[PDB]
Amino acid sequence: VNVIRVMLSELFRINSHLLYISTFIQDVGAFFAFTDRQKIYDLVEAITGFRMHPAWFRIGGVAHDLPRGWDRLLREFLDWMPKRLASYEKAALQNTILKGRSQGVAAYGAKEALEWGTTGAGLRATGIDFDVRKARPYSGYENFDFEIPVGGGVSDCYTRVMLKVEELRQSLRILEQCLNNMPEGPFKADHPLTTPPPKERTLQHIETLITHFLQVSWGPVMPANESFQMIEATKGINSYYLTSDGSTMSYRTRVRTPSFAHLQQIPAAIRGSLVSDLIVYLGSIDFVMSDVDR
């Protein structure tokens, strides 16, 4: 489950970065995401049955097991991106228009990143090496060999985009280890509170049928406690502060999203610049208003 949940996450991490890098380059400079993004969606669709909103992960595992043939699709994608990525960086590296319009725009250092809660490429561009996947390992990420792209002290529009390109290469590396080291065993935990329980047993065993009935009806009863898990998302550190009062529904679901903080730093980072600079900055910040407003 750890490796499956990492694999799906890195597929979507690439998908989001591709779109972000493509859009920035299209507007600021002069990298077709559609084609590469479709290949990812095809694997995700084969595994989840859906594209943008998989809703596959479950409390204790993933809704189903990997579909037979997933390895073939993944290998094909891991043999197509290598070259496509080479084209993505070359552009940014040699697009003088991009470099000229992006370098030294909306620049901020470590102090500004820390005071405004900036996380992700922005924080790393300031030179602070803080990636939750390495700082606070989760989902068995500690079992993967990858490097965190870090900047040199200045978080400008160009440095932010360049780190996102270097992240794609590291994500492809994790996806290769997932493909060659996919463990054999359960896709759902063997815990009384795994929801829903393995369907094959639910369809043939009364004890598992009873557990399923209640978990899909009144809901899974979570004992009273407070939990918190922060993860390195596609746009920065995203966390879920959950509070249970011992019921089948949350008493409080706090979702800390990186985009909300990145939009509050804009006034301090763009003051004194021109509107043209603001539009480039807005692009360099990988952000979606759904993450900001929730």
Partner 1 sequence: MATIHVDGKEYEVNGADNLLEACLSLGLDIPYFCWHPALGSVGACRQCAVKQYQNAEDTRGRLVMSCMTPASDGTFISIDDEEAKQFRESVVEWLMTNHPHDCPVCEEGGNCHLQDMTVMTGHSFRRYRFTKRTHRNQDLGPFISHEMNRCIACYRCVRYYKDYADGTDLGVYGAHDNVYFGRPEDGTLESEFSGNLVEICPTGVFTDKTHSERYNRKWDMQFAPSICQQCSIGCNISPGERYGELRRIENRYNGTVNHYFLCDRGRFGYGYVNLKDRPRQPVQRRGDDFITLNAEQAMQGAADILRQSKKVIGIGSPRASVESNFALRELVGEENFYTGIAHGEQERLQLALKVLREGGIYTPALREIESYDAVLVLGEDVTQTGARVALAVRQAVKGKAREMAAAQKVADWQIAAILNIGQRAKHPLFVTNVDDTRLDDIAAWTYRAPVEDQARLGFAIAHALDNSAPAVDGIEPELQSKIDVIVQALAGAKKPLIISGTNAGSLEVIQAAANVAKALKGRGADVGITMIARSVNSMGLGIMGGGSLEEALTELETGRADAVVVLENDLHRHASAIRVNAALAKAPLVMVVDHQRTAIMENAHLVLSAASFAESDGTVINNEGRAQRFFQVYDPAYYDSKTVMLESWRWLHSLHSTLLSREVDWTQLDHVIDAVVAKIPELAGIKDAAPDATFRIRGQKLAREPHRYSGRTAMRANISVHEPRQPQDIDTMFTFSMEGNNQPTAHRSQVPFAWAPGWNSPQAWNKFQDEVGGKLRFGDPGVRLFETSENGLDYFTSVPARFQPQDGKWRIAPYYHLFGSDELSQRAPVFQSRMPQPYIKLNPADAAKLGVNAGTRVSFSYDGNTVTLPVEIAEGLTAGQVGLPMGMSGIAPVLAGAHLEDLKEAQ
Partner 2 sequence: GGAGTDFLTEAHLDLPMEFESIGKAGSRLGTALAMAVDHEINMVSLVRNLEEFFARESCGWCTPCRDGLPWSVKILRALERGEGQPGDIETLEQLCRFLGPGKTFCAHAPGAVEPLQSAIKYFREEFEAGIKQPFSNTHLINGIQPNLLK
Partner 3 sequence: MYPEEPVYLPPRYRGRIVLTRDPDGEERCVACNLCAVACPVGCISLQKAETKDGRWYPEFFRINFSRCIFCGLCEEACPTTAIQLTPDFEMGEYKRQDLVYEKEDLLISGPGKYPEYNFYRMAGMAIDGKDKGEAENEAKPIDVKSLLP
Whole-Å CA distances, 66 to 34, 196, 206:
25, 17, 26
Rounded least distance, CB 58 to partner 1, Å: 14
E runs forming strands in 150-249: 225-232, 237-244
Shorter beta-carbon distance to partner 1: residue 30 or 210: 210
- For partner 3, what does the binding mask look like between residues 99 and 138, x meaning CB under 8 A? ----------------------------------------
Closest CA to 11 of 174, 185, 237: 174
Whole-Å CA distances, 22 to 12, 38, 64, 170:
15, 14, 33, 18
Rounded least distance, CB 199 to partner 2, Å: 5
Candidates 114, 209, 224, 249: give the one binding partner 3 (CB under 8 A). 209
Residue written as token pair 């030294």: 104
Q: How many whole angstroms separate alpha carbon 226 and alpha carbon 125? A: 33
Closest CA to 183 of 74, 66, 73, 79: 66
47 binds partner 3 (CB under 8 A): yes
Rounded least distance, CB 33 to partner 2, Å: 32
Q: How many whole angstroms separate alpha carbon 124 and alpha carbon 110? A: 9
Task: Report the site for partner 2 in 27-66 (rule: CB under 8 A).
Answer: 64-65
Candidates 27, 45, 166, 176: give the one binding partner 3 (CB under 8 A). 45
Shorter beta-carbon distance to partner 3: residue 247 or 273: 247
Residue written as token pair 């990298």: 31
Rounded least distance, CB 97 to partner 1, Å: 51
Q: What are phi and psi of 166, to 5 degrees?
A: -65, -30
Shorter beta-carbon distance to partner 1: residue 202 or 265: 202
8 A C-beta contact, residue 288 and residue 235: yes
Shorter beta-carbon distance to partner 3: residue 122 or 196: 196
Rounded least distance, CB 65 to partner 2, Å: 4
Shorter beta-carbon distance to partner 3: residue 76 or 226: 76
Task: Report the site for partner 2 in 147-206 (rule: CB under 8 A).
Answer: 184-188, 190, 198-201, 203-205
Rounded least distance, CB 142 to partner 2, Å: 21
Q: Which one of partner 1, partner 3, partner 2, none is in contact with 114 (Cβ closer than 5 to 8 A by kind)?
A: none
Q: Which one of partner 3, partner 2, partner 1, none is in contact with 196 (Cβ closer than 5 to 8 A by kind)?
A: partner 3
Closest CA to 289 of 259, 258, 255, 256: 259
User: How many CA atoms lie less than 13 Å away from 92 in the CB half-sphere?
Assistant: 25
Task: Tally helices (H) and strands (E) across the chain.
Answer: 15, 5
8 A C-beta contact, residue 125 and residue 151: yes
145 binds partner 2 (CB under 8 A): no
* Contact footprint for partner 3 (CB under 8 A): 42, 45-50, 53, 55, 63-64, 67, 196, 199, 202-204, 209, 212-213, 216-217
Contact residues for partner 2, defined by CB under 8 A: 64-65, 184-188, 190, 198-201, 203-205
